Structure 1
Amino acid sequence: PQITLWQRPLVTIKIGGQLKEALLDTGADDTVLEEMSLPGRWKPKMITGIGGFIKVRQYDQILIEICGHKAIGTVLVGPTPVNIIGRNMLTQIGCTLNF
């Protein structure tokens, strides 16, 4: 698709067969998710945003479908108000910024 930005670029994602929605976020290095059921073990990790550091749970090799495109990588579960799809995933689905 070609997505304008007059509203937040939220899209449908699928993880563990669960349908969610998430923000396509070119400003985010990592992918950070709301609480949800994920397989495997996690490890504690800390990342920062504009307001400072948070503790998150790091899951590796997670499969996700983003607006129909498959991606696999590291996802961080933590105190985020919204699922955020960061560049580690965005690149896998061929996403670009255009103007």
Structure 2
Amino acid sequence: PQFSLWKRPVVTAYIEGQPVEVLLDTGADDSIVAGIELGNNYSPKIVGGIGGFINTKEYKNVEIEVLNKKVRATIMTGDTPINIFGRNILTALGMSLNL
């Protein structure tokens, strides 16, 4: 369905079990969710945004149900001010920007 961008494109996701609220972010390459501890094996990862860098931990192949689709996804866990679903998941989902 359509999101006009007059408010933040935030939805309730399920990393599953866990409902998190997420920003749908065409300017993020990757996805970063705060406030979650996730699984056995992550890689160290370093992410560049505006005004600096952040150290996240990388969990691949995760249960994500959002927008009544289910996806297995790679999501990082870092100290982010807002949870972000970036391009890596937005493509999976088949979302686009129009017009």
**Which range, TM-score by smaller chain?**
over 0.9
Measured against aligned partners, the alpha-carbon deviations of 1:16-67 in whole angstroms (never above 9, x if no partner) come to 3111110000000001111213122212110100111110011111121112
Quote the Cα distance in structure 1 between the aligned partners of 2:58 and 2:11. 22
Q: Distance in 2 between matches of 1:92 and 1:22?
A: 16
Structure-1 residue corresponding to 2:97: 97
5+ long unaligned stretches in structure 2 = none
| Residue 13 of structure 1: aligned partner | 13
Q: Cα offset for 1:73? A: 2.0
Q: Distance in 1 between matches of 2:69 and 2:21?
A: 14
**Residue 43 of structure 1: aligned partner:** 43
Off by >4 Å, runs of 4+ in structure 1: none
SS at match of 2:90: helix
Q: TM-score, normalised by structure 1?
A: 0.93
Separation in 2, partners of 1:14, 1:55: 23
Q: CA RMSD in A?
A: 1.1
Gaps of 5+ in 1: none
TM-score by length of 2: 0.93
Instruction: Tell me the alpha carbon deviations over residues 51-88 of structure 1, each in whole angstroms, 9 at most, x when there is no partner.
Output: 11110011111121112111222111111111100000
Q: Is the 8 A contact 1:16 1:38 kept in 2?
A: no
CA contact (8 A) 2:16 2:65 kept: no
